[model samples]
Target: QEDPWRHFARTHAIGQIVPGKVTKLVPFGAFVRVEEGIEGLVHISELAERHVEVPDQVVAVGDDAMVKVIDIDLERRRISLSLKQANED
Candidate 1:
């Protein structure tokens, strides 16, 4: 059977915006759970339009946010998201 996660990444197009919840934080980014068993990374650079010294400065754990799918690497299972872009709407 095809991997469900891979299928999800392929079916979801780039630039598609979705609701997500901040699950955890890291020095470089935050882990957002967008769907069941589906998590994406909001890089520090993509967290805000302006410079952000820390990830928590813009978001806190359990906060609901909209994120745009900037890029997706199905082969590596990486999903790049941008909070700044989502806020543009």
Candidate 2:
């Protein structure tokens, strides 16, 4: 009787890097499906190390990319991710 996606999110702690596909994009950010039924938001500011005017410029739908889990708001059922940090190596 537990939400699988919620459990997955809880088990994955902040700062953990994971790969996901860019499912959609908006003016503010891009939606990435890290796992089945689990989508996280990569804010425009966090999309790249440099300034980005549009999310699509850095990522497009269906593009697979690595992302860092910056935050997890369980109460709000939201996960904030960062592509810029993940790209750092």
Candidate 3:
């Protein structure tokens, strides 16, 4: 079987920044399209420095954003994104 963790670590370790597009908007977070069949969440806490009461304030439904894969849990197939890290601030 292919090791999902290994695959992610290989790419993540190499500092690959995936171009993602915002696909969905929720009160707490938004989903971004990173790969052809993969989407990840930009949690409200990682959205901005401000207290995000609503996710829409940070990004709208069709926003194009660049997401850096900060963490990936292969056992759970979960990917964590950081918009703050990629920001120039």
- What would the TM-scores of all predictions be? 0.79, 0.81, 0.73
lDDT of each: 0.78, 0.79, 0.72
Better of 1 and 3 by lDDT: 1
Off by over 4 Å in 1: none
Give me the candidate number with maximum TM-score: 2
TM-score of 1: 0.79
The residue pairs found clashing in candidate 3 are none
lDDT of 1 by residue, 1-89 (tens): 34756777657777888888998887689988765656788889888768788789988899788798787665666677887788765
Candidates 2 and 3, the one with greater lDDT: 2
How well does model 2 score by local distance difference test? 0.79
**Model 3 worst lDDT window (10 residues):** 8-17
In candidate 3, stretches whose alpha carbon ends up further than 4 angstroms from where it belongs are 1-15
